[PDB]
Design a protein around this ligand. Structure first.
Ligand SMILES: Nc1ncnc2c1ncn2[C@@H]1O[C@H](COP(=O)(O)OP(=O)(O)OP(=O)(O)O)[C@@H](O)[C@H]1O
Ligand SMILES: Nc1ncnc2c1ncn2[C@@H]1O[C@H](COP(=O)(O)OP(=O)(O)OP(=O)(O)O)[C@@H](O)[C@H]1O
Ligand SMILES: Nc1ncnc2c1ncn2[C@@H]1O[C@H](COP(=O)(O)OP(=O)(O)O)[C@@H](O)[C@H]1O
Lengths: 511, 86
């Protein structure tokens, strides 16, 4: 048995490699004298899927190193497509034909010619047969499988499939014998990451550049979700500070410093700022009780085995910063995975491009254990307008099934809408699908207003005395983003005229 | 091994908690459909049948569909759901 992971190359996924070893590759490592009776033909092909950056391509070559081929030829799918019809399929034919010579020449004792596809998922779209929608590339796959399971079948081969979209592949491409067996890779647990860190450090520890104040046990777990690929870049970044340390003139952690730089596959901390200008200004009880409620039912999820999915939307009148509150609710529990979906970046897209950004985000999210995702300004991406009813049916349809779509077993998430008007939604039947709602009343009163202004501190006691004298009495109904807007508009004034400008403008709010 | 035929279990995602008998009607539903599937099971000149589950917005409809289909013991079962047709 040659399958031990004390060999350094990869780690953390030990069970999955064990499995392929268990049922996939046992035939090829066993004394053949027995099986030569049984005539058991080997797996010709295998599939493994998972997130992109989790070190799958070093598995394949490692089994090639483990059980020696001449060498791998690795290819990328898009590296072969041609406008000219003949060329693309022919390339594949060359790849296979390299082996057939040895197989027929040297019979059935030949060594493996191994193949790897970096991503199939474009080429292996599931063709379907009818007069229309035959397909664009539906004829390359025929040549492929005809090589795999075809006439003059060969036992001289091994082929590795790779994808991040396992469901689009045709079911016959992967029927048993052509590729029988599938494995899932999922983003590694902290144990796998401490192994990986042991790996990439193993030279540094030996060369003793980094001798001190370095613990992988904490430094692994402080990140709950990363890809093993980024960590090597991280280690390279960790290597960069010692070289950026000698710009001034034997190694230090800069990891705690640099982790803020890195966009993860998972959570990001640097996207708040555009959404959070000012932080969370608590003007009164409703604000704090709301985000307290957020902190309340988040625990529901994290402590629930029977409700993986939960959902709310923060409704309220406009310009109350519901977006910001949702962002804070995300930021409050230090989740593994948080992400924004917003029209800001999906701008100027068709009804089926933004959908494919959205399915991308959630199926990206499904495979994390615990997550919080947020969608802002539902009305906008739904492309709602009152004059005419107009919207894209596609979007809400594909959205609400996701609100009713449970992720795979053992993974849980909550989802957050910021919709500012729900009458449409009640009419449009998204509101029965959401579990529950939050009214976010905008500030209704001056006694709360001046309090907030004291928290900001723009205005003096006299400037504030002005307000306190004139109106205690009105109930002003105002969204706060507008408040900030016009104080900044009055903050520029002749000081004597500063305040009553604010007041006069403020009395134009309506209702 | 998942086959071309019935998912051996794929049902768990549709039923996470499992159906609970809270009274008579739950029995009523799936016994009625059980006789119905007997009807298709042994008959001539009704090669197919068409049934529909009506109910209010959350009644656990999809779940009981999975239950009836499982206990029906068919060789071949597929569920087409918009989840997959997004
Ligand atoms: N606790 C708080 N109370 C009120 N406003 C806050 C609070 N914390 C932050 N904000 C402010 O909310 C503003 C965000 O704007 P806002 O999200 O209200 O526009 P919007 O509501 O998305 O627009 P629309 O009303 O069309 O949805 C920021 O300036 C932010 O500082
Ligand atoms: N008879 C029952 N007793 C107890 N729980 C049930 C019963 N039927 C369904 N459930 C629970 O309801 C949940 C599934 O409901 P399901 O998704 O089938 O509702 P549905 O009617 O399809 O909803 P919708 O009509 O909104 O799609 C599961 O957790 C399931 O255990
Ligand atoms: N144990 C491991 N787990 C995850 N990733 C690893 C591990 N060991 C190495 N890696 C990194 O995984 C990366 C995989 O990158 P590659 O396979 O080229 O892109 P993709 O993973 O998207 O196909 C490699 O660059 C490698 O540095």
């Amino acid at each position: 048995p040659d399958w031990n992971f004390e060999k350094m190359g990869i780690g953390g996924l030990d069970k999955e490699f064990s499995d392929i070893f268990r049922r996939a590759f046992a035939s090829r490592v066993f004394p053949p004298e027995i099986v030569e009776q049984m005539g058991c033909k080997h797996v010709k092909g295998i599939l493994l899927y998972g997130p992109p950056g989790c070190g799958k391509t070093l598995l394949a070559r490692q089994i090639g190193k483990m059980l020696n081929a001449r060498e791998p030829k690795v290819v990328n799918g898009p590296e072969i497509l041609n406008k000219y019809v003949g060329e693309s399929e022919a390339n594949i034919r060359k790849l296979f034909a390299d082996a057939e010579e040895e197989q027929r020449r040297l019979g059935a004792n030949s060594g493996l010619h191994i193949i790897i596809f970096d991503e199939i998922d474009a080429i292996c779209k599931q063709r379907g047969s009818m007069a229309g929608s035959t397909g664009v590339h539906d004829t390359v796959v025929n040549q492929l499988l005809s090589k795999i399971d075809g006439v003059e079948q060969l036992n001289n081969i091994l082929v590795i499939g790779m994808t991040n979209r396992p469901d689009l592949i045709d079911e016959a491409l992967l029927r048993p014998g052509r590729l029988e067996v599938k494995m899932e890779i999922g983003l590694p647990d902290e144990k796998g990451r401490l192994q990986i860190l042991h790996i990439h450090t193993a030279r540094m520890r030996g060369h003793q550049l980094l001798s001190a104040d370095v613990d992988i046990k904490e430094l692994a777990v402080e990140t709950k979700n990363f890809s093993g690929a980024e960590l090597e870049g991280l280690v390279r970044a960790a290597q960069s500070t010692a070289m950026n340390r000698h710009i001034i003139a034997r190694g230090d952690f800069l990891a705690s410093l640099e982790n803020d730089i890195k966009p993860a596959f998972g959570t990001n901390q640097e996207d708040y700022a555009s959404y959070i200008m000012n932080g969370i200004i608590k003007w009164g009880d409703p604000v704090t009780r709301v985000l307290d409620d957020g902190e309340l039912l988040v625990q529901q999820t994290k402590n629930s085995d029977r409700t993986p999915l939960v959902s709310v939307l923060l409704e309220g009148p406009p310009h109350s910063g519901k977006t910001a509150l949702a962002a804070k609710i995300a930021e409050e529990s230090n989740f593994p995975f948080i992400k924004i979906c917003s029209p800001d970046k999906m701008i100027g897209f068709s009804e089926t491009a933004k959908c494919q950004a959205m399915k991308k985000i959630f199926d990206d999210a499904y495979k994390s254990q615990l997550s919080c995702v947020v969608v802002d300004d539902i009305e906008r991406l739904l492309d709602y307008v009152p004059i005419g009813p107009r919207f894209s049916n596609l979007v809400l349809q594909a959205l609400l099934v996701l609100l009713k779509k449970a992720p795979p077993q053992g993974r849980k998430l909550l989802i957050i809408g910021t919709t500012s008007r729900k009458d449409v939604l009640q009419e449009m039947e998204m509101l029965n699908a959401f579990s529950t709602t939050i009214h976010v009343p905008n500030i209704a009163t001056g006694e709360q207003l001046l309090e907030a202004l004291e928290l900001l501190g723009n205005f003096k006691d006299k400037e504030r005395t002005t307000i306190a004298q004139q109106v205690k009495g009105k109930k002003v109904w105002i969204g706060i983003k507008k408040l900030l807007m016009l104080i900044e508009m009055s903050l520029q004034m002749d000081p004597e005229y500063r305040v009553r400008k604010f007041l006069a403008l403020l009395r134009e709010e309506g209702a």
